[PDB]
Amino acid sequence: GCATIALAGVGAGLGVMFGSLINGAARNPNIAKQLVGYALLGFALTESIALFSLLVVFLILFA
Amino acid sequence: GCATIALAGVGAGLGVMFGSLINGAARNPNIAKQLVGYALLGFALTESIALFSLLVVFLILFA
Amino acid sequence: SVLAASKMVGAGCATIALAGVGAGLGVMFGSLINGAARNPNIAKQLVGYALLGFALTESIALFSLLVVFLILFA
Amino acid sequence: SVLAASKMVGAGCATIALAGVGAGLGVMFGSLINGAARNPNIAKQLVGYALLGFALTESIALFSLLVVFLILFA
Amino acid sequence: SVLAASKMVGAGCATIALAGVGAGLGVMFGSLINGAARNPNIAKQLVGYALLGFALTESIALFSLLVVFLILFA
Amino acid sequence: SVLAASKMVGAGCATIALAGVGAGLGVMFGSLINGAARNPNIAKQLVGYALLGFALTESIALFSLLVVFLILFA
Amino acid sequence: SVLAASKMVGAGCATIALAGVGAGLGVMFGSLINGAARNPNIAKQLVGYALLGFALTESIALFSLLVVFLILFA
Amino acid sequence: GCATIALAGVGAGLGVMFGSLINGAARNPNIAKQLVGYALLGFALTESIALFSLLVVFLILFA
Amino acid sequence: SVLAASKMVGAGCATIALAGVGAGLGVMFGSLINGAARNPNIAKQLVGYALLGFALTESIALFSLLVVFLILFA
Amino acid sequence: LAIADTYKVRVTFGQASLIVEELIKHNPQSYQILFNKFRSAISFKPTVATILSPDLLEKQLEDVTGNSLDAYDIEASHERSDVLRDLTEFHLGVTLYNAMLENNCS
Amino acid sequence: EAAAPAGPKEFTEVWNKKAPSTLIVPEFPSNYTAVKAVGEGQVHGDAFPVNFYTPHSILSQAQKDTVVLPGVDGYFGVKASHVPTIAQLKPGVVELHSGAESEKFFVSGGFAFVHPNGVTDICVLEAATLDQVDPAAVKSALAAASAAQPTDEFEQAANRAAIELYSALESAVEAKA
Amino acid sequence: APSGPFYRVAGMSYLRYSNICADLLRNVLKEPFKAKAQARQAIHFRQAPYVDGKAGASKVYELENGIPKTAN
């Protein structure tokens, strides 16, 4: 229970990233695929913390 | 009870993302039909983290 | 009597996930004020966008509500 | 019976969810000020959009204060 | 003896919603300064709207104080 | 004597509310600088609004100390 | 010795309120930097407001230190 | 479980960092090849703190 | 020896105020970079204010480091 | 300063902006433009167009019980005193181009 | 702070007492315009006047109900009762909407204002349409521009303007409607 | 010592900067319109400093390609 609290910051960081994707896509809509190509790069690079916080729960419960 | 706290962070991320959509649609409303499509992408992609908190609150109850 | 005591202590800590959701509604509606302040001619569609975000992120608040309802009596 | 003792502890810890809701209503009512500073001729309509945000962000305060009474008086 | 001590230890940590209430009022009264610094001749209307935001965000703080007087005295 | 003992950790968890009010006054007194950096000639009225926003959210910190001093010796 | 142990753990839970002044002071002293980078020709008045804001938001860190020295040695 | 809550802060930090990279690429798409080169360095210097937290969570369970 | 363990548990809880000071120094030293990218001709003064801001928030970092050793060794 | 041979090929905004930045090398608080406004082919009633310096006189003359320029939301990169500095150059160049083109057809 | 209450109203009564009597007062450029910012109106619903200018021509003066301006902070759209703003434009596409139609003009910079009465008046330098611009020479110019980084900060600023203009022109001509 | 945008810290005024931008828009125009674009670009004038009121030399500008991008 106390271990999975850290997904709060991961969810807030992804919400900031995908709100910034909207405010960047509305700042130059002709580049609205390269900015998503950066957003998915940041998303796939911040899910390392998500798999950290999802396997530390399985490190203590069943290992 | 202490496991479901990450919902606060994913809710704050949802709110800042859905607020940055209002900002981006007030910049230029003609591309809001693409901004809402990017926001539902970000919403469903951080609901991955939200349900990864919402299953760990279920996995420690009945499993 | 810890079997029904820990349900109450866990529920009091479970319902605190409404805080970040309320912060998200507040920043979304503050952005709604700024959005209707920049160009007010879309402020029906922008308030519709605010309700569109509001229901989808109150969905996660009712998910926490069914979690805190679920561990309290089931 | 420590069941009522844990009821008091959970009814204490339940009311920290108003932290983020207060921060959200504060940043929304602050965004009111610079939003109406951007265009003063849409002042009353921005206060109306602020009240429409207020009467839907206080729904989380309703959700929390009925849950603290479901802990205390149920 | 754990019950009237549990009232104390619960209603202690029941008041940390005031942290977020104070943060919301601080960002509201800072956005008041930014909005009155954008256009200085609107500085009487927007400070009244900031007083309205203060008196409607203190509903959350007095809602928390209603529970912290409800725990400690009822 | 846990009755007079848990009030200590209750007041310690109670004064957590003295964080977000400092954060709100930090962003308020930072926004005062960033607003007084735009137009320096309105800075007297901006500081007059800053102290009024201080004393209306200083009441949050005094309410936190009021519930703390209510729970320590009453 | 739950009194003399609860006092120490209440002091430990009581000094977490220096986080919010530690972030409010940081963003205020950063807003001072940004406001001096806007226009350097008023870099005397802005630090005069910045040390005032340091004092008035440090007041909450001293609230926290005073409640620490009250629940530690009384 | 208590030591790994520190992953929330590095998650919410990297969310704001990649949001800043999105908005920086929305400023000018030319200098994006140095924006990414600074961003992955900042990501590594924040994952330093993330792995510093993971070092103590592995120290507290197995030592 | 519950006080000798409670001092360790509280001394763990005493130092989570260092996170807020870390975030404040991060947002200060980030807006210092924003200010040195605003006008690079004054990159030698804004660091001169950044060092006094760093001193005045490392003040609160050592405020927390005071009480964690006052509860550990006093 | 005296500028000559100005209508050789035609009038361009590069030429007018060059004469404007030559007037900007000197640093006044105001500018006065004396040229003949082409009203009709029979009448030439001259005009005095005026350009103000940004921080020296322009926002000072926008001041009635406060200011009237604060209604405009500055949306540039840097702050208002450095966008008015560019706006006064653009205004002097535009009104000088229009001046020496009105005077040419006059 | 208003010690010289200037205007076209006061200049005649200060000028008549110094100039000889056969001289009429010199006129003012404000007498050749009727639309100001202080004179309210100019909305009457959704369609509002856009005044899209350039030094050698006037490409638009009619009323269009939506115009997006490629501002330096990003592309932003202007509505009828829009916020009064002074916006510096980066080189981008201006598009004029009055219904189903959009006229696409790529401008080369210049400011663009929104006045509190509800007229916008775009003030650009070179307004070339996106039909008569070729996609061949722009990469041939930026490829030479993306290499030379000399020691002249003046040429550094010129190179930076060239780089942003050519990159935005490529991104604005390759993604046409 | 000059503190502002990127052209201002480099000493460049807004007129020369925006004219450089307009010149480089004209430099990528189509040749049916690029030839007449040089007609609205050609600069032929001269100036003269006056140290006393008649005394002074002159300086000529006969640029047909556009506004000088180099330092002035």
From TrEMBL, chains C, D, E, F, G, I:
The chain crosses the membrane at residues 8-34, 46-73. Keywords: CF(0), Hydrogen ion transport, Ion transport, Lipid-binding, Membrane, Transmembrane, Transmembrane helix, Transport. The keyword Transferase does not apply. GO terms for molecular function: lipid binding; proton transmembrane transporter activity. It is found in: Membrane; Mitochondrion. It is a multi-pass membrane protein. GO terms for cellular component: mitochondrion; proton-transporting ATP synthase complex; proton-transporting two-sector ATPase complex, proton-transporting domain. GO terms for biological process: proton motive force-driven ATP synthesis. Residues 9-71 form the V-ATPase proteolipid subunit C-like domain. Belongs to the ATPase C chain family. This is Mitochondrial ATP synthase subunit c.
From TrEMBL, chain J:
It is found in: Mitochondrion inner membrane. Belongs to the ATPase gamma chain family. Coiled coil: none annotated. The chain holds residues 160 to 265 of 317 of the full protein. It comes from Polytomella sp. Pringsheim 198.80. This is F-ATPase gamma subunit.
Automatic annotation (TrEMBL), chain K:
It is found in: Mitochondrion inner membrane. The keyword Plastid does not apply. Keywords: Hydrogen ion transport, Ion transport, Membrane, Mitochondrion, Mitochondrion inner membrane, Transit peptide, Transport. Residues 50-120 form the ATP synthase F1 complex delta/epsilon subunit N-terminal domain. Gene3D superfamilies: F0F1 ATP synthase delta/epsilon subunit, N-terminal. One of its GO terms (molecular function) is proton-transporting ATP synthase activity, rotational mechanism. GO terms for cellular component: mitochondrial inner membrane; proton-transporting ATP synthase complex. Belongs to the ATPase epsilon chain family. This is Mitochondrial ATP synthase subunit delta. The lineage of its organism: Eukaryota, Viridiplantae, Chlorophyta, core chlorophytes, Chlorophyceae.
